[PDB]
């Protein structure tokens, strides 16, 4: 089902930023945002992303981190550029 | 806010099979991670078993591994229950409830159904 | 053991607080932490705290959460002589894998 590859695709990159936001206490993140990149763009609000809550706990159970990381593709690809640049 | 409704009471035998069902609504049936618990009368609650409703992932108990399945169907929004091997003492009021409030970011069991009370007997 | 211990029961006069405790392990409840659930005689358990020790809508300001490393604590200030009920705490096993209630105490105001 090319939904359910969407929603692992959209799983996999929120407990993915989590971590990239613990390892980063501050390159490869850099080429880890552009990654998750030409994957966005082979498939071309905030209630949205609430629904991926439960299924992101379930692979890393930290309410903590997730409510610090808190169309809504682009602008999570928009924060994970700025938070590269940076 | 996410509703649950809870089907009615339903008397079986040993060895037989229960089938309890809630279904819940209030928001995308994608964003739903009801569990089942078991209330036997007169102690206290006792987890059963889980659904995540996006990627269709199940976690039974250790001492349900291999009695209860938990299966979910998207077109009613409902969520089944099933108990292979039926005994004496497994008598008690069956409740759904997620497990979490998505819009806070937290895990606990929120909303509750009214319970199906389940009696075996003879 | 690994699952959740809670003391049977506990007995608090009117207009008075109440301190719970409930101790799991590193996994239980100190991992993350533990939830709170209010139970009356043959209802559904009513949530009071989350594994944050957030508020949920429908709960007054009476009650109030909080842990002390790994050990969750609940306290209820005032008691109210219709607050007749089981109080549970739930916590997710994180190397089980499983949701683990405690034994529950029970609450008798004396009035």
């Known amino acids: 089902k090319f939904h359910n590859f969407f929603e692992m695709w959209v799983t996999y990159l929120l407990t993915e930023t989590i971590t990239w936001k613990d390892k980063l206490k501050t390159v490869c993140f850099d080429k880890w945002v552009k990654q998750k990149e030409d994957e966005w763009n082979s498939i071309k609000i905030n209630i949205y992303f609430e629904s991926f809550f439960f299924h992101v706990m379930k692979k890393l159970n930290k309410e903590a981190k997730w409510n610090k990381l808190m169309d809504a593709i682009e602008l999570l690809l928009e924060y994970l550029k700025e938070k590269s640049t940076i | 806010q996410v509703h649950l409704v809870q089907s009615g009471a339903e008397v079986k035998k040993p060895g037989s099979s229960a089938t309890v069902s809630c279904k819940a609504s209030?928001?995308?049936?994608?964003?739903?991670?009801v569990s089942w618990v078991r209330q036997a009368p007169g102690q206290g609650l006792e987890w059963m078993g889980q659904i995540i409703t996006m990627l269709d992932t199940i976690t039974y108990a250790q001492r349900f591994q291999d009695r209860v399945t938990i299966r979910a169907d998207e077109t009613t929004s409902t969520i089944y229950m099933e108990l292979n091997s039926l005994r004496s003492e497994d008598t008690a009021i069956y409740y759904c409830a997620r497990n979490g409030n998505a819009t806070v970011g937290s895990l606990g069991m929120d909303v509750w159904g009214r319970g199906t009370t389940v009696t075996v007997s003879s | 053991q690994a699952g959740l211990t809670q003391p049977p029961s506990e007995s608090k006069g009117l207009r008075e607080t109440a301190t719970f405790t409930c101790t799991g392990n590193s996994n239980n409840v100190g991992n993350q932490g533990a939830a709170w659930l209010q139970q009356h005689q043959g209802h559904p358990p009513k949530l009071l705290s989350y594994r944050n020790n957030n508020r949920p809508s429908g709960i007054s300001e009476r009650f109030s959460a909080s842990r002390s490393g790994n050990t969750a604590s609940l306290t209820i200030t005032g008691l109210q002589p219709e607050d007749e009920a089981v109080y549970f705490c739930?916590?997710?096993?994180?190397?089980?894998?499983?949701?683990?209630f405690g034994g529950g105490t029970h609450l008798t105001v004396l009035g």
């Open positions: 209030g928001g995308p049936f994608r964003g739903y991670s």
């Open positions: 739930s916590a997710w096993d994180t190397s089980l894998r499983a949701w683990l």
